Amino acid sequence: AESTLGAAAAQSGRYFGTAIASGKLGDSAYTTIASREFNMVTAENEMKIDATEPQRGQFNFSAGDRVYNWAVQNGKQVRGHTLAWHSQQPGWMQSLSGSTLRQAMIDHINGVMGHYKGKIAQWDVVNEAFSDDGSGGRRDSNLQRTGNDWIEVAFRTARAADPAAKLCYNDYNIENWTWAKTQGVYNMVRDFKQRGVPIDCVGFQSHFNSGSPYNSNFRTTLQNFAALGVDVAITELDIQGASSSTYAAVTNDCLAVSRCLGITVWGVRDTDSWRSGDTPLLFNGDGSKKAAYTAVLNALNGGSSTPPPSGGGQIKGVGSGRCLDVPNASTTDGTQVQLYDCHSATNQQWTYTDAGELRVYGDKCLDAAGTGNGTKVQIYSCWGGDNQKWRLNSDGSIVGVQSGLCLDAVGGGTANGTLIQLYSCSNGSNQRWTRT
Amino acid sequence: AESTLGAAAAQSGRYFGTAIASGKLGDSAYTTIASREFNMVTAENEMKIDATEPQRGQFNFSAGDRVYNWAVQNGKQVRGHTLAWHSQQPGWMQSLSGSTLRQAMIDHINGVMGHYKGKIAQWDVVNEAFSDDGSGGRRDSNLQRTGNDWIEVAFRTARAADPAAKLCYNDYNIENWTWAKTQGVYNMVRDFKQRGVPIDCVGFQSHFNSGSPYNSNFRTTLQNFAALGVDVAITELDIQGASSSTYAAVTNDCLAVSRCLGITVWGVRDTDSWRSGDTPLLFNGDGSKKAAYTAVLNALNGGSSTPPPSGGGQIKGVGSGRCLDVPNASTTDGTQVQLYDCHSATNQQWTYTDAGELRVYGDKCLDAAGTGNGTKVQIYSCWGGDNQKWRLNSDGSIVGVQSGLCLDAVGGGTANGTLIQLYSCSNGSNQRWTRT
Numbered sequence A, B: 001a002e003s004t005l006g007a008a009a010a011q012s013g014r015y016f017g018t019a020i021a022s023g024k025l026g027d028s029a030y031t032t033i034a035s036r037e038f039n040m041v042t043a044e045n046e047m048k049i050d051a052t053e054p055q056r057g058q059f060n061f062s063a064g065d066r067v068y069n070w071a072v073q074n075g076k077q078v079r080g081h082t083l084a085w086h087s088q089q090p091g092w093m094q095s096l097s098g099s100t101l102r103q104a105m106i107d108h109i110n111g112v113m114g115h116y117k118g119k120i121a122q123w124d125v126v127n128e129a130f131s132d133d134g135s136g137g138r139r140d141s142n143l144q145r146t147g148n149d150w151i152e153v154a155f156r157t158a159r160a161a162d163p164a165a166k167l168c169y170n171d172y173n174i175e176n177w178t179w180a181k182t183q184g185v186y187n188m189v190r191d192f193k194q195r196g197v198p199i200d201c202v203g204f205q206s207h208f209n210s211g212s213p214y215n216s217n218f219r220t221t222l223q224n225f226a227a228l229g230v231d232v233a234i235t236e237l238d239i240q241g242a243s244s245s246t247y248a249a250v251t252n253d254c255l256a257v258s259r260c261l262g263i264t265v266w267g268v269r270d271t272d273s274w275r276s277g278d279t280p281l282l283f284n285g286d287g288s289k290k291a292a293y294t295a296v297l298n299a300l301n302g303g304s305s306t307p308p309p310s311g312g313g314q315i316k317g318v319g320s321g322r323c324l325d326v327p328n329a330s331t332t333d334g335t336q337v338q339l340y341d342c343h344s345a346t347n348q349q350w351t352y353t354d355a356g357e358l359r360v361y362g363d364k365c366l367d368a369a370g371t372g373n374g375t376k377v378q379i380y381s382c383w384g385g386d387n388q389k390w391r392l393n394s395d396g397s398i399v400g401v402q403s404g405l406c407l408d409a410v411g412g413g414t415a416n417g418t419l420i421q422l423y424s425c426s427n428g429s430n431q432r433w434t435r436t
């Protein structure tokens, strides 16, 4: 079922999930995508400390169960997030310290895991316990101030509460092997395994942005932890800008490590993101698939046999043999493109950007002035509009992110001068193109 | 005066205005920008038919004077918009026809211009009277069915009401000289001027987008109308995606036409735009100046003494005599840039795009990881974020759109390897650059 992320992921024995917000489950557009694309669910906030234990000793699972129920009803496994954490603690817990806090921490773990016993695949037992100052030490929080052994205690408590669950330590900025934080978590996990402290997995949040960017050494980081005898999981994936290349790279890294269980993107649509401003997810506001969605799916399906055109390249249609060409190498906005015999000419050299654009001349974008059939495909100044973004389907077609339509040679004409338009996608040779 | 659009425009005897919404005059961030940047105002809706005459015979100038007064008290002239139009007519007018309507049009023109007699610089007497079907003929409206001569009557009536006001015919899609609509309006005005019909100006709304793209022949259109003996004005300018080149082009088209009175953009911030989705204005919602803002300001001030580079060029520091360089021509995201002896190489070839990016390698963007002083300036995959958009100030400084900070050579360093950071613009030589 290589047509959806979850099913594609399943072809390598992995899962592909998302974070579900219970308040969005009544949104049909939202649930339609969520249910179809993922086979793993994480509650975005519903299973956190403040949501599950509002007052000390009083547990509440109405919010968490709404997410859980929806997940199982739709055939998805669930990752519990999160049991021990310095953030989003209910007021009563924030005011605790020392042994009083230590026991509350333990009491909380028993209460939540007990309620969900035998129903959770993975639990992020402890979340973000290391600092970002750069020395890879522990984050100073009320939890850490109860004693360095609090994490160990949390894991032992969790194991006893629900032995069927995989116990994960979850954190961010621990993807780049060169960062001190990453090495600090490694040493802790190694220490745990050596002394018999219960831990089965390490979750790498994977919140990538220009501040803490993706680095190919992520694969080694994954291998390094995997070699300690624990599984690894990409738990909260989102990339600032949503580079197609970066999304594909992350996917291939996980697929390269046998112990990488799966990938969870932190949200469904960009509009649902905790950082919508970074348009970091795979679907945009209107629910359409972004260029990065296609790159992720293709990556899950094993990628392509031959490497795409590195910088520049021509787009040749199979049912014509001609290359996508801008009439008379013009650079005037609003110029409808056409089919024409191939040759070395800039007005026939298109570049597919990580943003999903098909640029010509370096700053002119394949543009669609409309969303319906017949819409002329032209060139317009690049500005990032969804009508300037395209997805390159494995079947050789090129669909408009905004329109959902495919680049179509009018009347299936193959002769030179044949204009390009937007028409319902098919499989006709007048809609398939070959990178070169 | 050359730090604000209005002032820069004033240098050539022109003006630079915007459309003011009475409901936003209580928003200090709105007015802080409006009062500072523009010296001409058009009420976005407050002076239209339905707003000034909710019932035949009874005029309500409250909202209108609110805008007019704010304008005058803040040193701005006013464009009256608009006296006779098929849109936004009150309910009672939308039903009138023939004679009674013709008389209603006249009375309305008399009432409004009477109230504002001698206070209005330009009045859009007639708005959008030609259709977009491609015939080049009049639009079929209750107003047109009263007699093809309605437009002539409106102008004769207007001249009578207030002879001190320049009377304009305003429309959209009349910017491209090759369009039939444009010719339809051209012939009418030519006829009017010959037969003596009182008309002083033609307003070009200038709403450019992928559907009706800006075309360089726009200057030809302006020059052809100017030749007829009428003034011309860019009345409701907004460019989809707000390309710097296009904004600069339209500005130069006006500066090249002795009869072009000035330029008005249809709104203050992108969030105030009637078409926010197209982010077609000069200011972002947070109030920051967009790349296009600087392109317009530079254009109004007479452009750069030397013709700016055309994609893929070097950026050399004035104080160091060294170029903006990507260490070892690395392509990895997060790599901070440096200064280095200038030489022909891709890691020194920067392309400034219409969106305001400084690209390298084709799909890598000069990127600011944060917004405070000391923020590292690096390269990151291009995605259109404001932390990847820059303004090329005429003084040679390069300011980040998001941060409002200038590219800065750390500690005024001048040697190879000096790193680049963001910092408060200081006019220092380590913040000045020459593009070649």
Ligand SMILES: O[C@@H]1[C@@H](O)[C@H](O[C@@H]2CO[C@@H](O[C@@H]3CO[C@@H](O)[C@H](O)[C@H]3O)[C@H](O)[C@H]2O)OC[C@H]1O
Pocket: A132, A133, A172, A173, A207, A209, A211, A212
């Ligand atoms: O709630 C959590 C967020 O607070 C957390 O924020 C991360 C903070 O660090 C960011 O990267 C920094 C970039 O600048 C360097 O100097 C710092 O050393 C880096 O840590 C990172 O991008 C943010 O996401 O993210 C996880 C949330 O749960």
Ligand SMILES: O[C@@H]1[C@@H](O)[C@H](O[C@@H]2CO[C@@H](O[C@@H]3CO[C@@H](O)[C@H](O)[C@H]3O)[C@H](O)[C@H]2O)OC[C@H]1O
Pocket: A044, A045, A127, A171, A172, A205, A236, A274
């Ligand atoms: O007002 C509260 C909101 O600010 C709060 O926002 C949530 C904060 O956590 C987000 O998820 C985290 C992302 O970073 C990872 O490192 C963490 O592990 C995640 O838990 C979540 O997406 C936001 O919605 O939600 C509750 C509001 O009351």
Ligand SMILES: O[C@@H]1[C@@H](O)[C@H](O[C@@H]2CO[C@@H](O[C@@H]3CO[C@@H](O)[C@H](O)[C@H]3O)[C@H](O)[C@H]2O)OC[C@H]1O
Pocket: B044, B045, B081, B127, B128, B171, B172, B205, B236, B274
């Ligand atoms: O609900 C009403 C709104 O829909 C209405 O929107 C205004 C419509 O006119 C816009 O200005 C015109 C843009 O097109 C040009 O050709 C015309 O000449 C302009 O007048 C204006 O910006 C919108 O706000 O406003 C009133 C609401 O009640």
Ligand SMILES: O[C@@H]1[C@@H](O)[C@H](O[C@@H]2CO[C@@H](O)[C@H](O)[C@H]2O)OC[C@H]1O
Pocket: A374, A408, A409, A410, A411, A412, A423, A426, A428, A430
């Ligand atoms: O205007 C006409 C187009 O609308 C028409 O479009 C075709 C519809 O059927 C699809 O299978 C074809 O691929 C598509 O081109 O083509 C003829 C043109 O005159």
Ligand SMILES: O[C@@H]1[C@@H](O)[C@H](O[C@@H]2CO[C@@H](O)[C@H](O)[C@H]2O)OC[C@H]1O
Pocket: B132, B172, B173, B207, B209, B211, B212
């Ligand atoms: O209300 C009017 C709009 O309907 C009008 O729309 C234009 C129609 O033609 C297209 O080519 C243009 O892109 C589009 O803006 O614009 C003027 C406005 O007053």
Ligand SMILES: O[C@@H]1[C@@H](O)[C@H](O[C@@H]2CO[C@@H](O)[C@H](O)[C@H]2O)OC[C@H]1O
Pocket: B408, B409, B410, B411, B412, B413, B423, B424, B425, B426, B428, B430
């Ligand atoms: O390289 C940086 C200098 O360019 C920077 O210069 C300061 C800019 O702001 C002005 O108000 C100060 O007077 C001036 O010194 O200082 C920091 C340095 O790293």
Ligand SMILES: O[C@@H]1[C@@H](O)[C@H](O)OC[C@H]1O
Pocket: A325, A326, A327, A328, A329, A340, A345, A347
């Ligand atoms: O765009 C076409 C150009 O590429 C070709 O060389 O000559 C014919 C033109 O229409």
Ligand SMILES: O[C@@H]1[C@@H](O)[C@H](O)OC[C@H]1O
Pocket: B325, B326, B327, B328, B329, B340, B345, B347
């Ligand atoms: O990036 C620099 C490169 O351009 C120069 O040639 O050698 C030194 C490098 O740091």
